[PDB]
């Protein structure tokens, strides 16, 4: 039905082996929720836990927190208007929205004592039996959201504004990015159908069109997210450094200019931990390369041996099995990257998130493109280097030409498989898991439905937006640097994106708990990843056009094609950046409107008379250069006399 | 000696043929200098003119103008501190400097009536007999400046600060850029002497070092000019759009959001005029290419025919004559570009200056690099295309191998000649001209020296900073993309730069009138030119390394060298941009310092009692979820009871 006015829920498991140290700590938890000004209510928690629900009781402290937060955006330049006048009648002018209300209640829960909160961060302090502070889903809103989004072909800006109003700015920026990407993916769908139907195979024109589309989509999304950050009032929140509660330290030094005590970590220890990425990256390169070389050698052996029924089908079963198995290897590698990033100490949330995103992007880049890269650039130009692997396979079974159109076919079997297993591990396998959890199964006899709902809500996983960003970034990479082999692939991705905008919505609706509303200026470092996946596309796809249309292949033609495609990409990037700086986006227009919205003769004679008095008190030619003519009129007659006697001789 | 307190001088020639329309207009001029609040003094002007001197009489109007100008920088974000409190005691906290005082007096002279001034802009209005409004040089300051700068090996920041204090921010930014360029040019001087002494000829390592140096110098100058703009308080003055008084218009429309009347020009007419640049550019390409092809064909003919005394010397006389003659052709082309930019109507000063700088950069790029480009990239790989020119020269005189080390020798004869003729047309030819002007030759008998000084001052030319910027940009281009042929050239440029910092200073001292102090955030579009001259260097210089070290030359080796050098340049650019974003420049440090410098139980019980009263006035389970437990303590005992009965079963 509906929530009972509960703003946040803290789980607070109480294990039996450390009960007393939990229990008195539980008392401290209520103390930590009383001095801030939150009303608490303790209830039973399943699986040996003790749920507490917190809401805002006094609206005066909440209005003080709203005014202080708006002041905090005012000093950081996020809010350019007047914050408040130390009295809260301005909340009727700009209403407080549910996302920022939940964000401020979470800040009141989790910030330390010396900025108003009392931090119940579940890692550092004695409150280690806390592990999850989460808001509650509105099931009526989720049902209407899913019913509205599944009944429309396209989404407008009001839906993204509703997502910003409910779930915060990060989820709204993801859904706006996915909507813009899905709308921009119609263009390579149309030209991919045109290239697949008319242009034959491995068209250079399609590669140039993909590079131009990548440039146009990237810069137009940068303009669109600038406009969205101005519209949502979160422009410049990336400059606000947020302290990380898990950040370990040993020195609390002073700031050299201001004097606030800053907790400092030695950067050489962080560099020494960061240097562990290189053996991890090279070990991942070696292991994944050995696995991919073994799989392609196996499928070459099957193409050599297996004669007649299913050569076209059973010639990519190692590739299909690799795409099927790579979620498990990917999950192991992302767990290793998460452990390495937790080991690699970071003081701010944004740097930690950027480093994690970089590690995840590199790992998923390898495990999602290394097979296609080996096929297009190692197997195609020289396939004689993997002969001992076929010797090993022939010796095992005892107990030549390279097809240039291979990277086309293996792309098709790469895409259709990866659109199935990603529909498996993200949609239907969690559906079967929650159905199995549902089929496996006093509370004051008028709130037992709500307590059962919050008890099954806390067992769900916290929603991660970086995984969905990663999936769409890898899809953009497929379009940018491998869609020239199979031009229909973007079309398939288009259909997938229409599912994704709904299905990920369902992933927030029923398959995950409500995320904490966080404010983001942009999608962040994924932008950089997109930029990289643009540039490498101009290196990659056109090279495929030279390597599969070919008579022997020459190095100078390949280098000329790569050079021309990359310089065409750079020229198109400069032209699009020049054009899009002239469109006059309404954010800067509103900023200009806001910036616009936010006898002497007697005086000169009195001044020269004062100068005459000061001269008569005592630079004599300094005074008498000006004191000979001091009025307005006598300048006119002496100028006329100088004109008249100028022509008198 | 010293000026007589004169802030500005207006020349105001009065020709005899339109005397009366001048003379009454002269009266209007005094009116235009009286309502603003300036004291005027009319004096005789030589060569049928009538000089007037204006100073500030009332300091109240000047302080009002200072307060209004500081308010204007406050709304535009240039000045972040408090502007004023509507009373002028804050001028003792931050003293008014002579450059900004002259800038504000020039603004009071030249701005129109509806922002405080009374515009005596010498083009648009009835005041067309005005042609020059100029400040007066301080000859004591100029003498001490030249004596101080000629007696020091290096200049520190106090000298550039003195130049900012006297002549404004544009001249100071030029001298800071020249000082930074001269200090950074020691590095290619050292590695050029090392490559010329030890590495032989056409070193790839020297080309990579030049690319790395170009990257490091460009990004470090960007950081340095950001720091200088923060230090001088002119950070963000490029956002302040300044209206151009020569801008023609036919519609005065309204702003669509604010309502100020904006004078609009149709952009299709501006585009139609801008399209005239392409025939001008292609005509310049064709004419300069024909002249250069004729000159190199002539010198190939002299190398073929002239046998024994001076083949090494008389084999570059067409090139020497081309460098000697190119100032005249360059001046004709810059006059044509100035006429085209005056025809091409612009509404703002910055866009007009950027378009003029782009046209001048393209023309000077052609006339300063096209001979070296034709030698390095047209003559070297295939020199059989210019045989009919030698047939013409042999037919005229009647009445084969290509040296790969040619671009070295012609570079030397290009540099040593261009360091002489630019020392001719900029230093000693104006010296002989002013000596000839001096040798060719009542005023109230105590100010005749000052009147003769201001009479010989007004005949001088207004100082142009864009020409000196252009000369240093072309010198940077020589180092960036042609110093691999002759590595000693940067060394010569180093010596020239030590002259230039003094000689251009002398060009402002005795050879030009005092410029109007204008505030600039940066050196402007020349930065973009430097960036282009960096990137093309990675294309050019390494290509020379492939084209002159070579056995026939292959296309794939040249393309691989160009690709590796350009991608090394891009990688070095990314690395330097990453490193220089971590140095913590003191401008952002000062901005952070300035940003830093600029019981509840009873309340919750009262709120829940008010909720109980509102419930009793009449959502019953909504209230009774919280109303069953409202205090602090009973939550603790019921939580302890839930813990105790949780383990009781
Ligand atoms: C762009 C997006 C979609 C394009 C849809 C095109 C649908 C029309 C398909 C028309 C068609 O099938 O004929 C082909 C095109 O003939 C042509 O080359 C003539 C150019 C047709 C112009 C279509 C653009 C020849 O078939 P092919 O010879 O290859 O056997
Ligand atoms: C492919 C090879 C990498 C597979 C790594 C899978 C194992 C990942 C893992 O859990 O190891 C953690 C170390 O962190 C890491 O891995 C990072 C180690 C990087 C060293 C490179 C691996 C060789 C131990 O964490 P702890 O048990 O302390 O809790
Ligand atoms: C990434 C590393 C990939 C390592 C894959 C295993 C490498 C297999 C191996 O033994 O090394 C040689 C590489 O030749 C190969 O197989 C071809 C692998 C090509 C990988 C090169 C990518 C760069 C074989 O040489 P051969 O046994 O004949 O003595
Ligand atoms: C191949 C089929 C991969 C099956 C992948 C799978 O769902 O089972 C995983 C075990 O398999 C695995 O270790 C996966 C190993 C993948 C090896 C790569 C396959 C190439 C075969 C040529 C663990 O399943 P989980 O723990 O998620 O429950
Ligand atoms: C296989 C090769 C993969 C290359 C990966 C390069 C792109 C990495 C993705 C970029 C990223 O997500 O993190 C950026 C790291 O800065 C970087 O990129 C530096 C390069 C790191 C790659 C090593 C932060 O971006 P920001 O917006 O915070 O600034
Ligand atoms: C940007 C990075 C640029 C990489 C391309 C440069 C690779 C080296 C080019 C020279 C390769 C080479 O000399 O051999 C050629 C065949 O091998 C090749 O086609 C090399 C194909 C490798 C594919 C590399 C594409 C870059 C994709 C990322 C023909 O032999 P050749 O004419 O000399 O007789
Ligand atoms: C960098 C800036 C300036 C370098 C100044 C170097 C002055 C020392 C000059 C010493 C010298 O003339 O001997 C040359 C260097 O020998 C060598 O290759 C040995 C390396 C010398 C290391 C110098 C660096 C050999 O002469 P080459 O054989 O060419 O007849
Ligand atoms: C090399 C060929 C260009 C040489 C131009 C030298 C003549 C430059 C010149 O004064 O011509 C002005 C036209 O503006 C221009 O030139 C721009 C004309 C551009 C057309 C291209 C030239 C062919 C006339 O200005 P107006 O007499 O009206 O005062
Ligand atoms: C820039 C345009 C430069 C035009 C220079 C004058 C062009 C001289 C000319 O008549 O054109 C042909 C070009 O061959 C040449 O001379 C060589 C000029 C090379 C210029 C190519 C640069 C691109 C000669 O051909 P041919 O008389 O044998 O019939
Ligand atoms: C060649 C010597 C160039 C002499 C340049 C010179 O100072 O005299 C100019 C006349 O020469 C000129 O038209 C210059 C024509 C330059 C033609 C290019 C020379 C190549 C000769 C192979 C006009 O001098 P100005 O008006 O400044 O007094
Ligand atoms: C022979 C080829 C010469 C290429 C010249 C390219 C560099 C031109 C120099 C760049 C310049 O000074 O003006 C910029 C024009 O924007 C441009 O560059 C656009 C390219 C214009 C060149 C056509 C304005 O820069 P902004 O800082 O105002 O932004
Ligand atoms: C960035 C712009 C890149 C330009 C380089 C591409 C030029 C075309 C390369 C192909 C030129 C070509 O096929 O002929 C070669 C000789 O000519 C050449 O060395 C061309 C030399 C032209 C110099 C261009 C340098 C760019 C400088 C700006 C050898 O003949 P091949 O091996 O085929 O038998
Ligand atoms: Ca999916
Ligand atoms: Ca997803
Ligand atoms: Ca000079
Ligand atoms: Ca100069």
């Amino acid at each position: 039905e509906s929530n009972f006015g509960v703003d946040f829920v803290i789980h607070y498991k109480v294990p039996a082996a450390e009960r007393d140290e939990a229990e008195a700590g539980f008392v401290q938890l209520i103390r930590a929720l009383t001095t801030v000004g939150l009303a608490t209510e303790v209830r039973h928690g399943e699986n040996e836990s003790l749920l507490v629900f917190v809401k805002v009781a006094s609206p005066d402290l909440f209005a003080k927190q709203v005014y202080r937060a708006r002041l905090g955006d005012w000093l950081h330049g996020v809010r350019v208007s007047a914050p408040h006048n130390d009295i809260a009648q301005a909340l009727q002018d700009e209403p407080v929205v549910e996302a920022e209300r939940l964000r401020l209640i979470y800040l009141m829960i989790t910030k330390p004592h010396n900025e108003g909160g009392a931090g119940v961060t579940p890692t550092n302090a004695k409150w280690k039996h806390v592990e999850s502070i989460f808001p509650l889903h509105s099931h009526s809103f989720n049902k209407e959201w899913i019913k509205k989004w599944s009944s429309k072909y396209t989404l407008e800006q009001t839906d993204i504004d509703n997502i910003r109003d409910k779930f915060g700015e990060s989820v709204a920026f993801y859904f706006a990015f996915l909507r813009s990407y899905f709308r921009f993916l119609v263009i390579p769908s149309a030209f991919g159908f045109g290239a697949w139907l008319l242009l034959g195979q491995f068209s250079y024109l399609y590669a140039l069109l993909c590079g131009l589309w990548s440039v146009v989509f990237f810069e137009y999304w940068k303009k669109q997210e600038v406009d969205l950050a101005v519209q949502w009032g979160v422009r410049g929140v990336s400059s606000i450094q947020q302290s990380r509660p898990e950040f370990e330290w040993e020195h609390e030094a002073e700031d050299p200019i201001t004097g606030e005590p800053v907790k400092v970590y030695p950067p050489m220890k962080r560099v020494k931990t960061q240097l562990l990425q290189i053996p991890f990256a090279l070990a991942c390169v070696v292991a994944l390369g050995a696995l991919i070389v073994t799989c392609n050698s196996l499928e070459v052996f099957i193409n050599e041996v297996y004669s007649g029924p299913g050569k076209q089908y059973l010639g990519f079963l190692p590739t299909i099995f690799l795409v099927i198995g790579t979620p498990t290897i990917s999950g192991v590698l992302m767990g290793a990257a998460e452990k390495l990033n937790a080991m690699e100490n970071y003081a701010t949330v944004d740097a930690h998130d950027a480093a994690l995103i970089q590690k995840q992007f590199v790992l998923n880049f390898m495990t999602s493109y290394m097979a296609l890269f080996f096929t297009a650039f190692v197997y195609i130009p020289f396939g004689h280097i993997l002969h001992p692997f076929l010797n090993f396979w022939r010796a095992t079974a005892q107990t030549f030409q390279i097809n240039p159109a291979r990277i086309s076919n293996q792309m098709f079997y790469f895409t259709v498989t990866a659109q199935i297993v990603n529909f498996a591990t993200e949609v239907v396998v969690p559906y079967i898991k929650q159905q199995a959890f549902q089929k496996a199964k006093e509370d004051h006899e008028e709130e037992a439905e709500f307590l059962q709902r919050v008890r099954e809500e806390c067992t769900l996983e916290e929603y991660d937006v970086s995984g969905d960003y990663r999936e769409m970034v890898m899809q953009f990479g497929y379009v940018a640097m491998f869609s020239v082999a199979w031009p229909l692939a973007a079309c398939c991705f288009l259909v997938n994106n229409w599912v994704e905008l709904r299905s990920d919505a369902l992933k927030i609706a029923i398959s995950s708990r409500r995320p904490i509303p966080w404010r983001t200026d942009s999608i962040g470092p994924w932008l950089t990843a997109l930029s990289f996946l643009s540039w490498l596309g101009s290196i990659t796809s056109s090279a495929i056009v030279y390597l599969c249309s070919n008579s022997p292949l020459k190095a100078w033609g390949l280098l000329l094609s790569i050079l021309f495609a990359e310089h065409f990409y750079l020229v198109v990037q400069l032209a699009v950046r020049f054009v899009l700086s002239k469109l006059d986006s309404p954010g800067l227009q509103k900023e200009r409107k806001e910036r616009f919205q936010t006898h002497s003769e007697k005086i000169t004679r009195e001044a020269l008379e004062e100068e005459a008095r000061q001269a008569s008190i005592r630079g004599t030619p300094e005074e008498m250069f000006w004191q000979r003519q001091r009025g307005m009129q006598e300048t006119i007659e002496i100028g006329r006399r100088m004109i008249e006697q100028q022509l008198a001789a």
Side-chain angles (χ1 to χ4, degrees), chain A residues 26 201 210 223 310 365 378 393 418 434-435 458 474 479 604:
Chain A
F26 168 64
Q201 219 175 5
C210 289
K223 176 212 179 290
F365 188 94
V378 189
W393 282 121
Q434 63 84 30
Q435 277 282 85
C458 68
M474 296 297 103
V479 180
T604 52

Side-chain angles (χ1 to χ4, degrees), chain A residues 263-397 399-436 438:
Chain A
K263 300 178 289 294
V264 65
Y265 201 61
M268 295 298 103
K269 299 195 169 182
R270 190 171 296 137
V271 161
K272 197 185 296 181
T273 301
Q274 277 164 358
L275 283 185
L276 279 182
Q277 296 174 38
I278 320 176
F280 179 57
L282 297 204
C284 286
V285 163
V286 162
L288 287 176
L291 185 56
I292 287 168
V293 162
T294 318
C295 283
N296 296 115
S297 80
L298 182 63
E299 77 193 12
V300 163
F301 178 74
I302 301 299
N303 259 336
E304 183 178 1
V305 167
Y306 181 67
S307 162
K311 185 182 287 239
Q312 293 177 335
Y313 293 155
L314 177 79
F316 298 93
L317 194 67
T319 312
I320 292 169
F321 282 178
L322 207 66
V323 179
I324 281 165
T326 187
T328 80
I329 317 161
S330 185
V332 166
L333 287 191
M334 303 295 168
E338 182 65 26
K339 281 186 184 292
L340 183 56
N341 218 54
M343 181 171 335
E344 177 178 330
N345 215 13
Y346 277 113
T348 58
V349 193
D350 62 358
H352 168 87
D353 282 349
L356 183 63
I357 277 163
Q358 177 208 333
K359 289 173 187 65
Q360 291 177 337
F361 172 74
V362 165
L363 292 167
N364 190 179
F365 188 94
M366 293 182 286
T367 197
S368 70
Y369 302 118
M370 185 180 288
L372 292 176
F373 272 135
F374 161 91
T375 300
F377 297 132
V378 189
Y379 168 70
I380 286 302
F382 58 101
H384 53 80
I385 53 175
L386 53 86
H387 272 100
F389 265 100
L390 284 64
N391 285 119
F392 182 76
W393 282 121
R394 281 187 204 93
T396 318
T399 79
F400 184 72
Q401 292 177 335
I402 293 169
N403 198 6
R406 180 67 180 271
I407 192 57
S408 172
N409 283 261
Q410 195 196 30
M411 176 90 201
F412 157 73
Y413 291 107
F414 210 88
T415 305
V416 163
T417 316
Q419 292 327 288
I420 283 172
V421 293
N422 195 274
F423 198 74
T425 57
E426 208 186 9
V427 178
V428 288
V429 176
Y431 182 89
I432 301 299
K433 264 178 184 175
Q434 63 84 30
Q435 277 282 85
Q438 181 167 342

Side-chain angles (χ1 to χ4, degrees), chain A residues 215-230:
Chain A
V215 166
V216 163
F217 163 68
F218 180 65
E219 315 280 357
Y220 192 76
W221 167 247
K222 286 215 282 175
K223 176 212 179 290
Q224 212 166 338
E225 71 164 26
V226 159
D227 290 21
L228 278 165
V230 170

Side-chain angles (χ1 to χ4, degrees), chain A residues 35 38 52 72 74 117 153 173 197 202 214 227 251 278 287 339 369 430 475 479 509 578 617 626:
Chain A
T35 53
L38 294 174
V52 296
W74 185 90
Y153 295 100
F173 262 102
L197 202 57
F202 305 105
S214 303
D227 290 21
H251 286 181
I278 320 176
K339 281 186 184 292
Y369 302 118
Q475 194 173 283
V479 180
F578 168 71
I617 278 170
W626 301 92

